[PDB]
Enzyme design. Structure first.
Site, PDB file in Angstrom:
ATOM      1  N   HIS A  76      -4.958  -5.096 -12.685  1.00  0.00           N
ATOM      2  CA  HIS A  76      -4.053  -4.230 -13.431  1.00  0.00           C
ATOM      3  C   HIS A  76      -4.614  -3.783 -14.772  1.00  0.00           C
ATOM      4  CE1 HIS A  76      -0.204  -5.249 -11.048  1.00  0.00           C
ATOM      5  NE2 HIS A  76      -1.241  -5.732 -10.387  1.00  0.00           N
ATOM      6  N   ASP A 109       2.694  -2.011 -17.926  1.00  0.00           N
ATOM      7  CA  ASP A 109       2.700  -2.632 -16.614  1.00  0.00           C
ATOM      8  C   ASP A 109       4.111  -3.056 -16.222  1.00  0.00           C
ATOM      9  OD1 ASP A 109       2.081  -4.949 -14.564  1.00  0.00           O
ATOM     10  OD2 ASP A 109       0.237  -3.777 -14.818  1.00  0.00           O
ATOM     11  N   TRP A 136     -18.677 -12.004 -11.037  1.00  0.00           N
ATOM     12  CA  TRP A 136     -18.407 -10.577 -10.997  1.00  0.00           C
ATOM     13  C   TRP A 136     -19.561  -9.834 -10.339  1.00  0.00           C
ATOM     14  CZ3 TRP A 136     -13.564  -9.398 -12.477  1.00  0.00           C
ATOM     15  CH2 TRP A 136     -13.205  -8.044 -12.446  1.00  0.00           C
ATOM     16  N   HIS A 149      -9.620  -8.112   0.900  1.00  0.00           N
ATOM     17  CA  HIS A 149      -8.252  -8.614   0.839  1.00  0.00           C
ATOM     18  C   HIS A 149      -7.211  -7.487   0.807  1.00  0.00           C
ATOM     19  CE1 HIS A 149      -8.919  -7.347  -3.154  1.00  0.00           C
ATOM     20  NE2 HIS A 149      -7.999  -8.082  -3.755  1.00  0.00           N
ATOM     21  N   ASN A 186      -7.192  -1.526  -5.613  1.00  0.00           N
ATOM     22  CA  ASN A 186      -8.398  -1.083  -6.313  1.00  0.00           C
ATOM     23  C   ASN A 186      -9.606  -1.093  -5.381  1.00  0.00           C
ATOM     24  OD1 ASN A 186      -7.427  -0.464  -8.962  1.00  0.00           O
ATOM     25  ND2 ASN A 186      -7.285  -2.659  -9.421  1.00  0.00           N
ATOM     26  N   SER A 187      -9.838  -2.214  -4.694  1.00  0.00           N
ATOM     27  CA  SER A 187     -10.910  -2.272  -3.704  1.00  0.00           C
ATOM     28  C   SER A 187     -10.704  -1.267  -2.577  1.00  0.00           C
ATOM     29  CB  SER A 187     -11.026  -3.684  -3.118  1.00  0.00           C
ATOM     30  OG  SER A 187     -11.193  -4.668  -4.126  1.00  0.00           O
ATOM     31  N   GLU A 220     -11.498   2.437  -4.149  1.00  0.00           N
ATOM     32  CA  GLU A 220     -12.935   2.447  -4.399  1.00  0.00           C
ATOM     33  C   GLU A 220     -13.725   2.545  -3.103  1.00  0.00           C
ATOM     34  OE1 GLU A 220     -13.349  -1.202  -6.458  1.00  0.00           O
ATOM     35  OE2 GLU A 220     -11.880  -0.586  -7.974  1.00  0.00           O
TER      36      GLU A 220
HETATM   37  C1  LIG Z   1       7.112 -19.009 -12.103  1.00  0.00           C
HETATM   38  C2  LIG Z   1       5.713 -18.698 -12.648  1.00  0.00           C
HETATM   39  C3  LIG Z   1       4.842 -19.925 -12.324  1.00  0.00           C
HETATM   40  C4  LIG Z   1       5.726 -18.429 -14.157  1.00  0.00           C
HETATM   41  O1  LIG Z   1       6.329 -19.544 -14.875  1.00  0.00           O
HETATM   42  C5  LIG Z   1       7.543 -19.279 -15.508  1.00  0.00           C
HETATM   43  O2  LIG Z   1       7.342 -18.557 -16.721  1.00  0.00           O
HETATM   44  C6  LIG Z   1       8.565 -18.158 -17.365  1.00  0.00           C
HETATM   45  C7  LIG Z   1       8.165 -17.396 -18.608  1.00  0.00           C
HETATM   46  O3  LIG Z   1       9.290 -16.962 -19.362  1.00  0.00           O
HETATM   47  C8  LIG Z   1       9.419 -19.385 -17.682  1.00  0.00           C
HETATM   48  O4  LIG Z   1      10.695 -18.962 -18.159  1.00  0.00           O
HETATM   49  C9  LIG Z   1       9.593 -20.297 -16.473  1.00  0.00           C
HETATM   50  O5  LIG Z   1      10.235 -21.518 -16.842  1.00  0.00           O
HETATM   51  C10 LIG Z   1       8.264 -20.590 -15.790  1.00  0.00           C
HETATM   52  O6  LIG Z   1       7.445 -21.447 -16.579  1.00  0.00           O
HETATM   53  C11 LIG Z   1       4.345 -18.103 -14.706  1.00  0.00           C
HETATM   54  C12 LIG Z   1       3.405 -17.377 -13.721  1.00  0.00           C
HETATM   55  C13 LIG Z   1       4.043 -16.589 -12.548  1.00  0.00           C
HETATM   56  C14 LIG Z   1       4.547 -15.665 -13.684  1.00  0.00           C
HETATM   57  C15 LIG Z   1       3.609 -15.425 -11.591  1.00  0.00           C
HETATM   58  C16 LIG Z   1       2.268 -14.773 -11.916  1.00  0.00           C
HETATM   59  O7  LIG Z   1       1.538 -15.131 -12.833  1.00  0.00           O
HETATM   60  C17 LIG Z   1       1.828 -13.695 -11.032  1.00  0.00           C
HETATM   61  C18 LIG Z   1       2.421 -13.385  -9.871  1.00  0.00           C
HETATM   62  C19 LIG Z   1       1.892 -12.218  -9.052  1.00  0.00           C
HETATM   63  C20 LIG Z   1       2.704 -10.925  -9.270  1.00  0.00           C
HETATM   64  C21 LIG Z   1       2.214  -9.713  -8.460  1.00  0.00           C
HETATM   65  C22 LIG Z   1       3.267  -8.596  -8.546  1.00  0.00           C
HETATM   66  C23 LIG Z   1       0.956  -9.066  -9.049  1.00  0.00           C
HETATM   67  O8  LIG Z   1       0.953  -7.881  -9.385  1.00  0.00           O
HETATM   68  S1  LIG Z   1      -0.512 -10.017  -9.277  1.00  0.00           S
HETATM   69  C24 LIG Z   1      -1.805  -8.877  -9.854  1.00  0.00           C
HETATM   70  O9  LIG Z   1      -2.049  -7.848  -8.895  1.00  0.00           O
HETATM   71  C25 LIG Z   1      -2.626  -8.246  -7.629  1.00  0.00           C
HETATM   72  C26 LIG Z   1      -1.520  -8.285  -6.586  1.00  0.00           C
HETATM   73  O10 LIG Z   1      -2.035  -8.605  -5.300  1.00  0.00           O
HETATM   74  C27 LIG Z   1      -3.423  -9.547  -7.748  1.00  0.00           C
HETATM   75  O11 LIG Z   1      -4.300  -9.664  -6.630  1.00  0.00           O
HETATM   76  C28 LIG Z   1      -4.136  -9.442  -9.077  1.00  0.00           C
HETATM   77  O12 LIG Z   1      -5.171 -10.402  -9.261  1.00  0.00           O
HETATM   78  C29 LIG Z   1      -3.130  -9.547 -10.217  1.00  0.00           C
HETATM   79  O13 LIG Z   1      -2.891 -10.908 -10.572  1.00  0.00           O
HETATM   80  C30 LIG Z   1       2.104 -10.119  -6.976  1.00  0.00           C
HETATM   81  C31 LIG Z   1       1.275 -11.376  -6.765  1.00  0.00           C
HETATM   82  C32 LIG Z   1       1.785 -12.593  -7.557  1.00  0.00           C
HETATM   83  C33 LIG Z   1       0.780 -13.736  -7.360  1.00  0.00           C
HETATM   84  C34 LIG Z   1       3.170 -13.046  -7.075  1.00  0.00           C
HETATM   85  C35 LIG Z   1       3.572 -14.330  -7.810  1.00  0.00           C
HETATM   86  C36 LIG Z   1       3.622 -14.183  -9.356  1.00  0.00           C
HETATM   87  C37 LIG Z   1       4.895 -13.353  -9.686  1.00  0.00           C
HETATM   88  C38 LIG Z   1       3.672 -15.617 -10.041  1.00  0.00           C
HETATM   89  C39 LIG Z   1       2.519 -16.522  -9.556  1.00  0.00           C
HETATM   90  C40 LIG Z   1       4.988 -16.308  -9.684  1.00  0.00           C
HETATM   91  C41 LIG Z   1       5.153 -17.611 -10.454  1.00  0.00           C
HETATM   92  C42 LIG Z   1       5.269 -17.367 -11.960  1.00  0.00           C
HETATM   93  O1  LIG Z   2     -16.737  -9.557  -8.276  1.00  0.00           O
HETATM   94  C1  LIG Z   2     -15.906  -8.662  -8.494  1.00  0.00           C
HETATM   95  C2  LIG Z   2     -14.502  -8.756  -8.251  1.00  0.00           C
HETATM   96  C3  LIG Z   2     -13.706  -7.713  -8.529  1.00  0.00           C
HETATM   97  N1  LIG Z   2     -14.193  -6.536  -9.047  1.00  0.00           N
HETATM   98  C4  LIG Z   2     -13.293  -5.414  -9.345  1.00  0.00           C
HETATM   99  O2  LIG Z   2     -11.990  -5.931  -9.536  1.00  0.00           O
HETATM  100  C5  LIG Z   2     -11.013  -5.031  -8.962  1.00  0.00           C
HETATM  101  C6  LIG Z   2     -10.211  -5.755  -7.909  1.00  0.00           C
HETATM  102  O3  LIG Z   2      -8.938  -5.094  -7.757  1.00  0.00           O
HETATM  103  P1  LIG Z   2      -8.095  -5.229  -6.425  1.00  0.00           P
HETATM  104  O4  LIG Z   2      -6.791  -4.568  -6.665  1.00  0.00           O
HETATM  105  O5  LIG Z   2      -8.895  -4.751  -5.215  1.00  0.00           O
HETATM  106  O6  LIG Z   2      -7.894  -6.793  -6.236  1.00  0.00           O
HETATM  107  P2  LIG Z   2      -6.904  -7.680  -7.099  1.00  0.00           P
HETATM  108  O7  LIG Z   2      -7.663  -7.861  -8.419  1.00  0.00           O
HETATM  109  O8  LIG Z   2      -5.560  -7.039  -7.245  1.00  0.00           O
HETATM  110  O9  LIG Z   2      -6.873  -9.005  -6.334  1.00  0.00           O
HETATM  111  C7  LIG Z   2     -11.796  -3.815  -8.469  1.00  0.00           C
HETATM  112  O10 LIG Z   2     -11.807  -2.796  -9.461  1.00  0.00           O
HETATM  113  C8  LIG Z   2     -13.186  -4.400  -8.210  1.00  0.00           C
HETATM  114  O11 LIG Z   2     -14.224  -3.432  -8.310  1.00  0.00           O
HETATM  115  C9  LIG Z   2     -15.537  -6.369  -9.309  1.00  0.00           C
HETATM  116  O12 LIG Z   2     -16.001  -5.335  -9.771  1.00  0.00           O
HETATM  117  N2  LIG Z   2     -16.324  -7.453  -9.016  1.00  0.00           N
END
Ligand SMILES: CC1(C)[C@@H](O[C@@H]2O[C@H](CO)[C@@H](O)[C@H](O)[C@@H]2O)CC[C@@]2(C)[C@H]3C(=O)C=C4[C@@H]5C[C@@](C)(C(=O)S[C@@H]6O[C@H](CO)[C@@H](O)[C@H](O)[C@@H]6O)CC[C@]5(C)CC[C@@]4(C)[C@]3(C)CC[C@@H]12
Ligand SMILES: O=c1ccn([C@@H]2O[C@H](COP(=O)(O)OP(=O)(O)O)[C@@H](O)[C@H]2O)c(=O)[nH]1
Length: 471
Positions: A17, A112, A330, A348, A352-353, A356
């Site tokens: 993000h 965001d 990376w 996965h 973004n992937s 790209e």
């Molecule tokens: C519940 C908790 C563990 C949270 O803890 C709480 O925090 C609040 C703060 O006020 C307290 O009041 C509570 O008592 C408690 O301590 C902290 C972490 C957290 C927030 C979540 C988290 O960090 C991330 C996600 C995540 C959201 C989402 C929509 C993404 O967009 S992730 C993002 O984009 C892609 C999506 O695929 C990823 O691949 C990227 O790398 C990037 O991170 C979807 C995925 C995910 C993992 C869902 C779960 C959660 C909302 C998560 C882990 C829930 C638990 C939460």
């Molecule tokens: O070794 C790595 C891992 C990730 N990326 C970049 O990280 C982003 C991954 O975003 P994506 O939404 O595909 O995965 P997410 O981070 O949500 O799991 C893309 O821009 C990738 O090019 C990269 O450049 N090198």
């Protein structure tokens, strides 16, 4: 159009993000408007400074949450506790972010969806706010359809996206936890003036621009793929983080291979597979007999491991057979995907992937894990037909070594060969990926779909600014 616009961007401290939203802000910067990223110092270091492009940084509260000084993003986190700290650190930074925006109000805020407190900030300042999640508009439609037509609580397994423009079956049901976290964010994001999507209408599908606009009642803005804002080698190679290996080391090694003879395997940031799972991937990689670029963030900082620690996740003699590059950190993904030697991508299905890979014209092997990826899996394989599926059906809520079902090496190899062996199916899949690749080259160029959307977006933001000047 007489004076430029003052736009602030507040990206979340997540690689998926942070990266796209800054490139999207670079598209605004190319038009002549003063953009400003609001994030932590480490995340703003990798950002190339364009014209009008500036950053405002607040120091990351490392000891307040309990993280080393080198961790200011979710990509450097290997634990579920880390994601909580990145979030908690975002809660502490919320104070100074609101104060800075209140002292110097911008013409528009882009923030965001993970941060929903920007709603009150933009409202009291009476400024237009834009929401950003980096999902596909196709996926956003699918997740709002499940929010209007919830699945029965007991139900599990494959399901049909309800009341969609096209009948599409996702391979597994989402976790009940996912609904409780996502739905509040989508509701606050739907209270925004518009939605920014890092995609183009030729890929998501016009029937979903018309679905999101008429069925849900909200405006979306196709502005991507913003990865095209990086044209030089250095702009493509430095993204989010500096590469772990020398960028020229990859190019010299890829330049010696044939076209479409390399498979790139990267499950993105925030996904970490257990050692058993990595063993099945590694066995399926060598069994396919194809050269590979494998990104393994699970073992970053674990180089020169003892022979015991390396056999936990690699077959004996795997690194001795130098038929690939195991990158423990990376990788220059835009560079590796851009090379003509890479002809397949084990992904996965992160968005973004995905975009790209559409730009580079590489077919994808789909292995979704969490979030929006199981909807993206079917957008890649059924809707646009630019990829094949592994066949996984585990939709975890957290991907930090949490997967409980082992994906066998016979399942992975079978999907790898369905694109690398050059079968009659794989030939026309690569043709439909090249058709989208040529279209993608000029969707951000003058006259393209996403280019003109940004033109319309700027004009409406300029209008709202001219209305505030009246008062
Ligand atoms: C519940 C908790 C563990 C949270 O803890 C709480 O925090 C609040 C703060 O006020 C307290 O009041 C509570 O008592 C408690 O301590 C902290 C972490 C957290 C927030 C979540 C988290 O960090 C991330 C996600 C995540 C959201 C989402 C929509 C993404 O967009 S992730 C993002 O984009 C892609 C999506 O695929 C990823 O691949 C990227 O790398 C990037 O991170 C979807 C995925 C995910 C993992 C869902 C779960 C959660 C909302 C998560 C882990 C829930 C638990 C939460
Ligand atoms: O070794 C790595 C891992 C990730 N990326 C970049 O990280 C982003 C991954 O975003 P994506 O939404 O595909 O995965 P997410 O981070 O949500 O799991 C893309 O821009 C990738 O090019 C990269 O450049 N090198």
């Amino acid at each position: 159009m007489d004076k430029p616009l003052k736009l602030y961007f507040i990206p979340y401290l997540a690689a998926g993000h942070m990266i796209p939203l800054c490139d999207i802000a670079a598209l605004f910067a190319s038009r002549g408007h003063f953009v400003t990223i609001i994030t932590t110092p480490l995340n703003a270091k990798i950002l190339p400074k364009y014209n009008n492009f500036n950053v405002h940084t607040f120091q990351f509260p490392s000891q307040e949450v309990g993280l080393p000084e080198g961790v200011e993003n979710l990509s450097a986190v290997t634990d579920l506790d880390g994601a909580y700290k990145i979030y908690q650190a975002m809660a502490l930074l919320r104070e100074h972010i609101e104060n800075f925006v209140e002292q110097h109000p911008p013409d528009c805020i882009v923030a965001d969806f993970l941060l929903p407190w920007v709603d009150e900030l933009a409202n009291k300042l009476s400024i237009p706010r834009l929401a950003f999640n980096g999902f596909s508009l196709f996926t956003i439609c699918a997740m709002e359809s499940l929010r209007s037509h919830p699945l029965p609580e007991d139900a599990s397994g494959p399901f049909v996206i309800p009341n969609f423009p096209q009948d599409i079956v996702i391979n597994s049901t989402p976790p009940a936890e996912s609904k409780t976290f996502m739905d509040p964010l989508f509701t606050i994001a739907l209270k925004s003036n518009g939605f920014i999507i890092n995609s183009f209408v030729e890929f998501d599908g016009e029937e979903y621009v018309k679905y999101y606009e008429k069925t849900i009642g909200h405006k979306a803005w196709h502005l991507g793929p913003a990865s095209l804002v990086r044209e030089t080698i250095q702009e493509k190679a430095e993204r989010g983080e500096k590469s772990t290996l020398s960028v020229q080391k990859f190019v010299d090694w890829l330049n010696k291979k044939r076209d479409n003879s390399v498979i790139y395997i990267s499950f993105g940031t925030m996904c970490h597979f257990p050692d058993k799972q990595l063993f099945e991937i590694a066995s399926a990689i060598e069994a396919s007999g194809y050269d590979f670029i494998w990104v393994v963030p699970e073992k970053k900082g674990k180089e020169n491991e003892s022979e015991d620690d390396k056999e936990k996740w690699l077959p004996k003699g795997f690194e001795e057979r130098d038929n690939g590059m195991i990158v423990k950190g990376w990788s220059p993904q835009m560079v590796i995907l851009g090379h003509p030697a890479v002809g397949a991508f084990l992904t996965h299905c992160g968005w973004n992937s995905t975009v790209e890979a559409v730009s580079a014209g590489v077919p994808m092997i789909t292995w979704p894990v969490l979030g929006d990826q199981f909807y993206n899996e079917k957008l890649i394989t059924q809707v646009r037909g630019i990829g094949v599926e592994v066949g996984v059906d585990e939709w975890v809520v957290t991907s930090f070594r949490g997967m409980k079902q082992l994906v066998g090496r016979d399942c992975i190899e079978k999907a790898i060969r369905r694109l690398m062996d050059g079968g009659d199916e794989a030939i026309q899949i690569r043709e439909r990926s090249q058709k989208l690749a040529k279209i993608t080259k000029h969707v951000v160029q003058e006259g393209g779909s996403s280019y003109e959307n940004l033109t319309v977006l700027i004009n409406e933001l300029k209008q709202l600014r001219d209305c505030k000047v009246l008062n």
